[PDB]
């Protein structure tokens, strides 16, 4: 393999040189003869073995002591020695608080699909490795939401639950996000609420939830601790900051009755640090406008409001070449940004966000020797070519520590 | 080495890809690093040794395509190409193979959203051409046929293959019809900034520039490795659309216009090991190629500020989405203008819809369709088109269109 890789920005002619790719660890799914960069996901009861774990822990501990300019120190060699002994006598090991914090920050720093990574170093890490029950999971998660929401001045956070052991005692948040809206399939095939969450809502309802059956019902937390069956918990509604969507120029836009929650918090991913697997690690930041305005509101298999918005704009909807869809999508995304800003809820438009990412990516090349980025995800779902990332060549590779996907818990859980 | 599935996440349609098992050119990716966003991922004169397998493979898929694999014609066409590579170090394609080759290079073009049309391709054989005047003649016939008074038709003209690398046929323009770009004394750029260097090459070669904003560049034609020569396309062959908006009547005051015929002239057509370094090909525009990229790139006409100015939009903050609002209007005007002048154009909703249908077809009858998501997804309104939620496998099939160095970096004058 080659030691230097060049990427070019075709708008500004800047050429950057990647050496960091040499440290990539996992497979991309691509080979010499096929590229899978547009594939979304290129037994979970199986856990790492002693001999698998020794080099994974050593690699991470080396990286950690290199970051603190203590590589090869006495502290470093004693840490290696200590971790090798735990793995030998228990087939696992425990991270120090400082290592858990470094690893989490670096999982975000390595997240090739995240346009927000300029902020990676500023991440509040909540250590919840002492949790044993689902009530305690709920307690930890409520503090996360409250801290991260911060009355509208959102702060990025992660809460980390105990690592996997034998695979039969996993902690999971069954929710895909801490805060989502319920989706109710109707007898007539229509959908009330959020179509993306129909399946999860049926699971909550089965487990005992009484749904209000409205358009914006915050789902309950479904929490699994130490491998037990999950348990329901209603987030205190005063902890769920919401934003009603109105438009600066169109008086009627509030009449759609749209609102959205302020805190995007992914809760279904796996955090891998030095070969340890933290199956429950909800993390939160703040929204880029387009995630709400374009996808959540205008995807066909979502709230699907372009039609109704276009009707109220009186657009010719008979032919596609009028571009009525594109015209309504922009107004929708103006109303989303206008609403969050009026209510002083942190949010970022796709211009500012991509602009920050280019600056971040250049800094990482300069100071770190590269910045893995997944162009298919970094480029916003609207107005792509008028943002700087569109013209930026990117290298995509998997560095550890990292956030990974994992199967849905209802597909694997053994019921007590 | 398996059948691979691709999922559409809107419709949940899953297609199974076997065609990739037949590819042999490289993508640029590795198990550890993906280069799906590198534009040109990573001398060229092959010898007899490399040439016969490539040729044998191409004849194989040709006779396979016409339901006569392993026939007498197939046996004999193999030995004819064998003898010919043997003695002359190259070989000549039949007319049928040439047509089949050009159509399948289009069909194999991962970056092209317009491939549902791939087999309606008019192939002009120009392999008898020897001079730049002959090139100019074949190019004028191409432009006249493909334009067709507005009802455009897909066409490719194929000049002689590369031989020793010293006698290359090259069209120095990147497209047959483009506007010129001028560096100003005050620093700015008049016309099209992407063509500033090529415009100076033409001026240096004797061209007298009008120094307007939409000046059609002359053809610069290189035949058999000689110095390129300048030719003016007859203006009556150059169809142009003045851009006006159906709601904003001030839009015509902008004085914008574009040409009707997109005709890529700087690529290399590779068929069965043969290199056609001159093969201008043309179809018709997707509205966004003009209205998003040509007019609204920073490194191009960069007209967004002017438009949102006349729309009287709040341009202080980025979060008013004033760029995005002006972009849709510009792209309505392009589509409105072309349709009103009855020049063939497709909008990015209809084209991506067609490409999905094309994909279904190719998976049905061919077992796959190589597709470059990065290039297939339109440069605006991405996720409200069907291709955004379409998984695509990218892989390199031949015959194919490849990039080649710009001639002014390679050519040795005299
Ligand atoms: C602070 C502001 C943040 C912004 C503006 C932001 C922005 C984004 C966006 C727009 C995406 C694409 C999401 C999608 O389209 O589904 C994304 C993905 C992602 N982000 Fe960030 N994010 C932020 C915070 C974070 C934090 C705090 C973490 C981890 C500590 C993180 C890790 C990730 C990961 C792992 C993905 C990939 C998710 C997936 O594959 O589904 N992000 N981010
Ligand atoms: C007939 C209507 C056609 C439409 C609507 C269409 C559409 C497109 C578009 C939008 C692109 C991306 C172009 C860019 O951003 O530079 C593209 C690329 C491409 N098209 Fe098509 N196309 C058409 C015809 C053709 C024909 C007739 C050929 C060949 C005979 C062809 C071969 C290619 C190739 C090789 C590329 C890749 C260009 C590159 O890598 O720079 N296309 N097409
Ligand atoms: C199924 C139909 O469309 C679906 C919708 C979804 C649209 C994008 C999206 C919508 C959300 F509401 C959401 F919470 C996230 C979370 C991502 C995230 C995480 C963090 C930490 C910060 C931040 N800003 N964002 C992403 N996309 C995956 C496909
Ligand atoms: C450097 C960054 O900016 C640049 C701008 C440019 C914008 C895209 C573009 C604009 C054109 F005017 C054009 F003719 C073509 C030709 C493509 C084509 C070929 C055929 C056969 C048919 C058809 N319909 N289109 C493409 N894009 C490559 C990047
Ligand atoms: C960096 C990136 O590869 C480059 O800017 C690409 C992105 N996608 C594109 N897609 C199309 N259709 N045309 C282009 O020129 C580009 N440019
Ligand atoms: C098919 C394709 O892989 C898929 O639709 C991707 C495209 N890019 C994306 N980009 C972001 N940010 N989020 C997404 O969900 C997707 N979906
Ligand atoms: Zn790849």
Curated annotation (Swiss-Prot), chain B:
Lineage: superkingdom: Eukaryota
This protein's record includes keyword Membrane: yes
Tissue: Isoform 1 is ubiquitously expressed: detected in skeletal muscle and brain, also in testis, lung and kidney, and at low levels in heart, adrenal gland and retina. Not detected in the platelets. Isoform 3 is expressed only in testis. Isoform 4 is detected in testis, skeletal muscle, lung, and kidney, at low levels in the brain, but not in the heart and adrenal gland.
PTM: Ubiquitinated; mediated by STUB1/CHIP in the presence of Hsp70 and Hsp40 (in vitro).
Broad class of where this protein is predominantly found: membrane
UniProt GO cellular component terms: calyx of Held; caveola; cell periphery; cytoplasm; cytoskeleton; cytosol; dendritic spine; membrane raft
Sites where the protein binds heme b: 112, 403
Family: Belongs to the NOS family.
Function comment: Produces nitric oxide (NO) which is a messenger molecule with diverse functions throughout the body. In the brain and peripheral nervous system, NO displays many properties of a neurotransmitter. Probably has nitrosylase activity and mediates cysteine S-nitrosylation of cytoplasmic target proteins such SRR.
Written domain comment of the UniProt record: The PDZ domain participates in protein-protein interaction, and is responsible for targeting nNos to synaptic membranes. Mediates interaction with VAC14.
Quaternary structure and partners: Homodimer. Interacts with DLG4; the interaction possibly being prevented by the association between NOS1 and CAPON. Forms a ternary complex with CAPON and RASD1. Forms a ternary complex with CAPON and SYN1. Interacts with ZDHHC23. Interacts with NOSIP; which may impair its synaptic location. Interacts with HTR4. Interacts with SLC6A4. Interacts with VAC14. Interacts (via N-terminal domain) with DLG4 (via N-terminal tandem pair of PDZ domains). Interacts with SLC6A4.
Protein name: Nitric oxide synthase 1
Full protein segment contained here: 303 to 722 of 1434
